[PDB]
Each structure stands twice: as structure tokens, then as C-alpha cells.
Design a protein around this ligand. Sequence first.
Ligand SMILES: COc1c(N2C[C@@H]3CCCN[C@@H]3C2)c(F)cc2c(=O)c(C(=O)O)cn(C3CC3)c12
Ligand SMILES: COc1c(N2C[C@@H]3CCCN[C@@H]3C2)c(F)cc2c(=O)c(C(=O)O)cn(C3CC3)c12
Lengths: 196, 199, 435, 432
Amino acid sequence: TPAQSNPAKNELYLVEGDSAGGSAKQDRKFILPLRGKVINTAKAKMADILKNEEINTMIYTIGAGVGKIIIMTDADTDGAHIQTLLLTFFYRYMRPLVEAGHVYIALPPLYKMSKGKGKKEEVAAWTDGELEELKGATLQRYKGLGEMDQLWETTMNPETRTLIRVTIEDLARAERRVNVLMGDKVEPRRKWIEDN
Amino acid sequence: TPAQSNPAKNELYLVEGDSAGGSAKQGRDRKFILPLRVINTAKAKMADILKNEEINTMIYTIGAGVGKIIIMTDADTDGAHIQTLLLTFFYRYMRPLVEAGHVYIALPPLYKMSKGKGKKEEVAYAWTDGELEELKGATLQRYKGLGEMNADQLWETTMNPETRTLIRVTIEDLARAERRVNVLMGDKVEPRRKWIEDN
Amino acid sequence: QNMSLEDIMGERFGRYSKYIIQDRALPDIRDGLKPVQRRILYSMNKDSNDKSYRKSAKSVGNIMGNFHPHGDSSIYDAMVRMSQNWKNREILVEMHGNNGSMDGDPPAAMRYTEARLSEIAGYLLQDIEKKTVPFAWNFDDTEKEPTVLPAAFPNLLVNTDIPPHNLAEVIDAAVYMIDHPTAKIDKLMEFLPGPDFPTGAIIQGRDEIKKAYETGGRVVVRSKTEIEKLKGGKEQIVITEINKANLVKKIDDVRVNNKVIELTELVLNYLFKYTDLQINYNFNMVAIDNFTPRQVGIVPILSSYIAHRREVILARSRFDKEKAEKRLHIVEGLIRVISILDEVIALIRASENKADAKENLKVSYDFTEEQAEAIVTLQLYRLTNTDVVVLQEEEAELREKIAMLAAIIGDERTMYNLMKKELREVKKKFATPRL
Amino acid sequence: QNMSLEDIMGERFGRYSKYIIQDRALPDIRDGLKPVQRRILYSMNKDSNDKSYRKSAKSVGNIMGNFHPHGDSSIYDAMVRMSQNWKNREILVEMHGNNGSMDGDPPAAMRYTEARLSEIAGYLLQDIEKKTVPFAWNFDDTEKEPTVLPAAFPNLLVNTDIPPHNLAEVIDAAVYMIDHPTAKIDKLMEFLPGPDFPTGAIIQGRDEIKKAYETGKGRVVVRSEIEKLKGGKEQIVITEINKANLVKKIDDVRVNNKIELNTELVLNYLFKYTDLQINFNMVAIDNFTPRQVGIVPILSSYIAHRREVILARSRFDKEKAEKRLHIVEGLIRVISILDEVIALIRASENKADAKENLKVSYDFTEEQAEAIVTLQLYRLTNTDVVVLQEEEAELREKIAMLAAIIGDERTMYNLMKKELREVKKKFATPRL
DNA sequence: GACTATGCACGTAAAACAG
DNA sequence: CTGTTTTACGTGCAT
DNA sequence: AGTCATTCATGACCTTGGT
DNA sequence: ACCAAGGTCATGAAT
Ligand SMILES: COc1c(N2C[C@@H]3CCCN[C@@H]3C2)c(F)cc2c(=O)c(C(=O)O)cn(C3CC3)c12
Ligand SMILES: COc1c(N2C[C@@H]3CCCN[C@@H]3C2)c(F)cc2c(=O)c(C(=O)O)cn(C3CC3)c12
């Protein structure tokens, strides 16, 4: 389940599903496909979490335990719930990991632009206000870490994308993470979508 | 893996893949069933065959061993290799089974004909060759293999046993074990290339 | 530059936000189709499925690459769901080849099933044709996709939880609500005494439902149980939106633990509350109205769906009307043209180009482009303009409909008389018994 | 009645027969596409795929329910196969999204991959358009399906086993064979010294191949860097096999102590045992009948296969012209009396009434009469007064040539040359 | 969304065959 | 601890 | 061509909880 | 072994 590799710069990219972790394992590790939706930490029991191969396999690779790990999702709003949890999975447990702040959440491409139908003319992480900088040609829109060699546009230049996480967290934020994700009493969640 | 059931008439229908054995287990208009999802007997070793869950699960259900089991394929020429083998699998081992001749090989439908687009007007034929002529203005079908037949329809080969089936093996004898070691199983290649002189 | 460090107070607020508006993939108060549905009913349209049974692979594939980025079997799987008669009242898609037993039956992959849009199925997608419900963009940005199919059959309360209620009772109330707007929940339950399930049988909770219809509660539901006497002198009481997958063994569990089935009538009473052979039900009236997720009730739902059609009909009006106008105008023109077919057939020869010819119809006329067009797009066939007297007749034929349609536009009262005759119409054709 | 008892001497003869003609699902001596292939290249056509990358689900789905009853993943799976550059020479379909490593890589289901018909891909399906190759019926009996796509690029020997041989060498021989029919296998190997593999490198067996090219059976050979590292150590490492087991196979030698870590004899041990330097079975279907052939047959039938493709594209395109010059030839005439004609077509009667009545003031035929009536008042501006005249010669030239390709055995091949040369160049490949 | 057995042929590298 | 036969492993298209 | 775990919510039926 | 809290299992549309 891992993807091979001297902890000179850490280096541990966390992909979504064997298509991604397959596309990735095929250009820049100084990899471990996380399969399906991970467990909601604050959503069950500690014994619970120890039974889950997703929590297990994770903490196996790289020691740590309770007492550059890049995390690669997609664009899917489906792909967020898989950012959302993992961070909680990196947070409630493995605090210092992101307390140090060594963990970072990779910045995939949005809309690639094309042109010549034989001369090849490609481009490249916000198809909103960003995309305007780029008729007569062609476009695309990126459907999630998979349909992407190209992969070294988020792969083989680490800083060319990534985003460093957790900076100056603190407290009163553990308030929101037991509010938003995990598993509140429902009441709170229905409630955070007053800003929705 | 079986499909439930007093050996009053034997009764054991052998389908192809859990789609069929699923369509059948629902259409049990006639279980007085087990999905087969097979090894070429004369193609390996006895130890071999004992290792294969397909030989195993088979001989499990119903005792017998070495010393009305209807078998339901499709129309697929793919679906034959699964007639071809099983019979060898019913033959080289479990001889008397078909030596008695208690086993039969089910006669699925070929081309179903349709008509009214709301009044429902269906048919049936087990040979869309010379048979089909007995049946413009209407519509037709062609049957793609034991599956696309709903569970209800399925009682057209299901809930009238004799309405279809075909009894097997009758007056075999010897000099036929000659051809079955020639045709299927696993000859030396030479023989097989050779039987397609009548092909 | 590995830039942009951010707060987990930040990023877990922003991601989780995206994902929560992905919980308006839930049934709308109008269509009552939850998008992964809406889209499979449209793609089976657009592709023309009264015809023969089209495989699946193609069907799902085509759903799955034009209107739905997500999984294959996620897509189709959901489709099978709409195939299961014992899941809906009107099955909004008919397939063939092992739909799947109430007896815990895994249905077979796309590789085997053939399907096709179903009768009542027609209904909902029964007027996408025109500029009816407002259609949006593809994700690929290729085709366009509709945002809630306009809907004949009130899929919403005839199918967040909302239990079946039977076209029969639904369009019946539907009727009432219209001609009488302000209505009490007690007088409207007269039409829908309760939810009909495919496996209805018996549902208990008159006062429990009654309140629930505005509150948006808990009912009750009993099995199809039989009392009869076998031979030799023994008891024969056996069984004919639950699940037969666990009640089959659940019966035989009672016997296995000898703690209480054609083998005392108080005895049936034990299983009839513990063996899950008379469970149920709950109700959780919850959809999306005003593009915003809300709990509603028997009055809202019918309320918005009345309003949802108010604007379907209004559209089918405003449109079909404009299509006529546009026709009566080249008819109105071609008639005229008859008068001087000779002169016209004249300068269109000695004219010059194509675009040269229409312009030059500034003289000997005052026709417009769309006027001029067909006068030049004609073909020497129709120069046999037999419509000499007919076209005259059209001027009144097509002007009648443009009199009616535009009348539906100001006529609030006539409007509903439409939505009646129609709803009554399904009431009858695709009408259901009771349960 | 449970009727019809039968001999297992009977039934096992008759079933097994059906199944064995299901072993002419094997590459044809012409297309060199094995049906499950042929059909995916056509369905990706018919649907128009130079355009954008169309998902898969739709692509396979559509292959899978119009031309192929069998599995989904059986279908698509095989498609992926045609995506793998390191599997063919000309990859007859380009996809994007994890084709699959030489490093033992499971490709992802239809749910992810997007694909599209490939450059050289074009080639083969490059003239289905007309009544070229003879097309048969659907299984559903819905559309019709072609029985061997006509083929520009000699997929057959450029791709029962037949190893790559490189468009370069192939059309080069192809050339020779034509203008010189009877040829020896030795003079023709001059053009194709051997099969090129995507991972060619080194292939040994000059006398072994030479004989094999007529015998259609034999065995060749195939071989897999020398440099000096720092500090004074040996650095000899590696750059149609499989890298899935050679990765560990190297490290197996080390594990059993029996690779930039200094005897050159050492490399010799691995280079024959470690599978780091590990046949041919010329076999297809010709004359709708499964046969072994060789370098001469294959080119022999494919020459003949085009002989009849070209002849078709002749006989057809010719007939399409005839049919055009005839309503041109007609409409010209009609100009002369546009006035009179524009006449009775008014006072005529019906539609079908109007064309008939063009028995008088003319002798035109139906197809003649048609467009004279199907016309539109636009074209009554019949500017072609003088042009159409010109067409009579434009379209009559081509009907002079095409029909000339019909008797001209010698001119014919000069076609099949210029074309085959044409791919030789455009979709031309280096060497290996 | 990757596990898994098998047939169909035919090569051959890796186990079992004896004393 | 040999040299032999024998055995399983691999590959595309199906089930 | 089935296998398998989990999210997300919400309920009734079973597993612990203590002595 | 009571009666109560906690624990599980299940259901559609996704990964
Ligand atoms: C067994 O569920 C699935 C899994 N897995 C969950 C399992 C347990 C944990 C360890 N991993 C396995 C793999 C997966 F990885 C992908 C899909 C999937 O793509 C899909 C579809 O829409 O096509 C449908 N399903 C199921 C709903 C049928 C998928
Ligand atoms: C794993 O192979 C398959 C099996 N099985 C073989 C396994 C080992 C023995 C015990 N049974 C399982 C089931 C099956 F039953 C059906 C299909 C199938 O339909 C299909 C396709 O064309 O869609 C493709 N494949 C594979 C080529 C991908 C199938």
C-alpha cells in the first residue's frame, strides 16, 4: 500500500484513491493512496479508530503515534470532505505534526487551456478571478486529481503549488472543529450554516 | 452459494454466473439452484481438481463423489464452453450421474417477438432459424444469454420443466471417450487442430 | 514559493463549506427529483426512450459523461433504485433483467440490465420540450442541463424523508388546493387519509399523522397477516417500506429461541411488535424550496408545486404564443405574396446574389426579413402555391391559438382550469388504486 | 414434453463447434484488428473522435451496446491495451489519465480515463466513409458493422503472435512487393532487417529470423550501460517484456548472492538467467480461414486487400460523380428555358404533378427533374449560367480518371504507392 | 475500485523426482 | 549433493 | 462480478453497565 | 438476572 522512498526533508504525499495514488506513484518523492472517506475521529471511539485500516495504515507509515507530509485531494466538493476529515485526523491525534506545521495541503490545477491541434499549446489554480489572465483557442476544467507527466505540475515542483497549514491556530478553534466536522449533536452543524 | 430447496425428483438447476443464478433464484417458479461462476478435468491433475472451488462446491451440494440436475447456459458461443466442460466435469467424474442419464441441459429461448406498445403481446422461439418463420407490422428481439429475461419470463424455461429441457447422454457407450479426450479437456493440440477438419 | 499558510480555523471552515452546499443534492419541493435522479431522467429523454429496451452501459455511460461527473455505478446504481416497483409508487423507469428481489437481491452490473423510461415516467419530463423550466449549463460546458424538470405527476409527495402518497389522493387534493387556496390540514387529509406504500397493508396513527401534516412525527404500520385453519387441527397464520431480507430469518429466530409459522392469538401479538413484522414508521418532511433547504408540510409542498406549475404553464403559454406570432407572420406575408407571385418571381431572378434578392424586396413590398426569408427560401414545388385560399384560412387558425394562449397570460382564473384538466388527466390515465 | 435426448457424442460435438468458430475472433491478415478491436476503433469513429477528449464510460458504453454484446471491462480493458505506447508501435488510440506504467500499473476504471482516436489511428478507418470495405449487420440488428476496416497503416505486421515491425520498414517493403510481385524473402528482409519493438535495443538472430519469414515459426533473441562511478567502483545499470518482475529479479541475484555497485563476466550471468535478456508465431485469418502465413503472404494479401479497397473507392466515387454531372448536365439545359420551365411548374398542379409534366418541353429523368423542382427561389438567380457549363468538364474529368483506375492495373498500384509513401512520411517512425 | 480462478496455447523458469 | 521430468507462471480476450 | 469500510442523520433494536 | 445507557445496524447517493 505504500510507494517506497533518510528523513532529510520528510516527504510523504497523501493521495485520494488508487487512481490518484496510481497516477502519482508513476514524479517527485524525496506515496500512500488513502482509499475511501476516512473516519470522523470525534465521530466515534478511540477503540473505534484503532479498528480502522485508514487510521492504522496511516500511523504505521511514519512512527509518531498519539503521544513534508503533503495531502493531495481534488477539486471535488466531494474531495473536500477528504481534506476536512484528514486535518481533523491530523489534529485531534498527531497534534504537533501540524502544530510544528510540517503538513501542507496541495494546490491542484483548475482550468488548463489548450490551442494548437497538433502543435501542442498547454497552460495552467483559480478559474475564477485568476483565469482571466489567460477566443480562438480552447479550454478545459479539471475534474479531480486523476485525469491529469502533467502530474509534475503539482508533482515535481513542490513549492510550485503546495499550501502550508495550521499557522497560528491556537484554541477557541478546537471549538469550531467540534462544531463543524467530527460529529456534533446535529444542532450546531445545522447552525454553522447560518453563514452558508 | 446454494439456493435452498426430500429427494422426490432430485431437482438441481445449474446456472451461469450470479446474474443468471440471481435471476433464477428469484424466478424459483420451479425449485423442487446454484450459480456456477470451470476447470477442464482432463486438463490438469486430480489434486488439481480438488483445489478448485468450482469442482468442490459442486460435489458438495449433493453427495455422490468419485466412487433432475438441469444445467442452464445461455446462447453465447461463450456459453457453450460452459456446457462443454461441465459435461466433461459430469463425465470423467460422476459417471453414473449421466450414465443413468438423470442430468439434462436446459433449452433457453432464442428470439422473442413483441407487438402492442401498451397492450403487451409477447411470444417465444427456441430456434430463430427454421423455427422462427412460424411467427411485418410487429416487432422482434434476439436473446443475448440467460439474464436479460426477467424473473417472470424466466418461468418460460423455469416453471415448466419439460416445457424446454433436453435429456442428455442417451446411449453413449465407448469410442466416445475417444472424442472427449480429443475435443475438449486438453489434447496434445494436434488432435484439436485436427477435429476442425469438420469445422 | 511554498506560499499561503492558512488557519485550520481557516481551511476547515472553507472546505467544509463547499461540501455542505453539496447537501442541496437533496429532493426539491417541486420536482422531488434529487439531481443524480433529475439527470438520469433527462438523459434517458434527450436520447429518445415507447421505443425498444436500450441496454444500460450506453444509458448510464451517457448519463455519466454529460450530466454527472461522479461514479458509474454510483450513477446507475441509483437508477436501478428507480426501477424497483416496491420502492416507489410510480416507477419512474422500467427495466428488465433482475431488478432485484425484496428478498435481498444484488442486481447485476450495467453489463446485463436493459432499461427504458417508464409510463408515468413520461409525465415529469413532459414539457422540457419548450422553454418551460429554466435550464442551466453542463459541467463540461458541453450540453445544457435543466434545474428541476417541470413535472406532471407530483413525484414529491407521491414518492429528509417523504413517504409515498399515491397519485390518486395527491392530484385529488391538488385539485382542491387550487380552487380553494387557504385550506386547513384536517379537510385536506380527507383526500389523502395517509401515505400509500407499495406494500401498504395497514397504517395506524390517525391523530399522529394529522398533526404531522403541518409539523413536518411518527405513524405505525402492520403486516399482511392471515388467519386460517389447516388440516388435522392446527393453526395456520402466515405472511403473504420495510425489508424482507431480515424478516425471513426474524420469524425463524422466534422459533430458534423458543421465546413466544403455519404451525394462541396472543402469540402473534408478541412477534407483531418485537419481530420487526410490524415496525414503522417515521416521517421527516424535508426538501429544498427557494433554493434553500427547509422542512415543510402537506400545505407547503402542494403550495409550491401549485406555484411551480403556475410558471410552467405561464411559460408554455408565453412561448407557444411567440412561436405562433412568428408563424402567422410569414403566413400573413406569403398570402400577400400570392397577390404578386408574378412580380415577385420576377426581381428574384434578375436580382443578383442570395442576400441581394431579399433586400431588393424593399420595393413592391414592406415585408420583414423573416417575411422575406421564406419568400426566397421557398422551392419551385410550392410555387404551385395552392394555399391561395388555405393560407387565408391559416391567418385565422393560428390567430385563434394566439388569442387563447395570450389569454392564459392575463387570465388567472382560466389558468388553473388548465392545471386542473391536466392533473385530472393523469389522475385517470396513470391513476392508481389504493393502499 | 422433456423431449430430445442426445448423445454426449452428440452435444459435446455440437457445442464445442460453435465455440471454436469463436476462435476466428483473432487478428485478420489484412486489418490485423481482432474484432473486439475493430469494433472499438469504429465506434470511436462513427461518434466523431482531432476533437476534445471524450470520457470513457460513454465511449465504452457506446462500443458495448452497439457492436459488442460482451463485458464492459472486457471491452474497455482491451481498449486501454491499445492506449499503451509501450505495447504497440502506432498506438491506435490515445488516452489521458494513467494509461499504466511498465512498472506493473493497474489502470483505473472507465470512471476516470478520457480517450480519443489517435493520429495513425485515423489511417485504418480512413475510408470507411464510402462503400469501401464490405460492412455487415449489427447483433441487435440496429446499426451495421464493418467486417475488417480497410486500413492505411499495415497494422498487421507493424503490430497466433506477430511482433512490431515499424511503419518505416513495412511500407518500404510494401512498395517493393507491388512493382515487383514475385520476391525472395532474403531481398525483402533488406527493408525490414527485423521487428522493431518500442523497447527495441538489441535483437540477435539473423539466420533465425531469415528462415522464419517464410516458415512463420521460429525464435529470435533480445538484449537489454557501462560507466565508472566515483571512489572507484563499477557502475553498470539499466535504462516486449515486463519491468514488473525484472525490478525484483535484479535484486534477487543479490539476495541469493549467486546494481551500480568489477567483473564483466558477472553481467553475463544475469544477462541470460535474470530474464534481463530473454518467439514468433505467424498466425492469422485469411480467406475467412485461420492459417499460418509469413512475410510474403501477409504483404501479399494486404496488397490484394487494397487492390479492392482502391477499386471500390473508384467504382463508388465514380458513380457519385456520374449522378452529379447528370443533374448539372440537366440544370444547364434548364437555364436555356428557365422561363418556360418556371412556367408549367406554377400552373402545374401538385408536387408529384409538377415533375411528371416535365415530359414535355424536355426529356429529363427523375433525378433530372427532382432538383429542377426541389430548387429554391434563391438559385432561380441561376448565376451558374456559365459556371455549370464549366462543371460539365470539371466533374467529367474526374469521371474520366476514376473510371480509368478501373481498367488500369498499372496506374492502380501507383496510387497505392503515393499513399503508402504518404504515411511512410507523415506518420513515419524512426528505427529500433 | 482493486482482490480473486480459469481456458485457450505455448514457452520456460523454478520445484520436485531418486539414493 | 546431478540431471532429469515435471510443475507452475505469464500473457489478452472472454466468463 | 460480487467482496469489502465510511460519511452523513436519525431511529428502534441488541450489546454492556452494575451487584 | 432488572432497568437503564450505551452500542450497533440499516438505509441512498457519494469516495
Ligand atoms: C465498496 O465500495 C467502494 C469502494 N471501496 C470501499 C471498500 C471498503 C474499505 C477499503 N476499500 C474498499 C473499496 C471504492 F474504493 C470505490 C467505489 C466506487 O467507485 C463506486 C462507483 O460509484 O462506481 C461504488 N462503490 C460501492 C457503492 C458500490 C465503491
Ligand atoms: C475478475 O474477473 C471477472 C470475474 N471473476 C473471476 C474471479 C476469480 C474466480 C472467482 N470469481 C471471480 C469473478 C467475473 F465474474 C466477471 C468479470 C466481468 O464481467 C468483466 C467485464 O467484461 O466487465 C471483466 N472481469 C475481469 C477482466 C476484469 C470479470
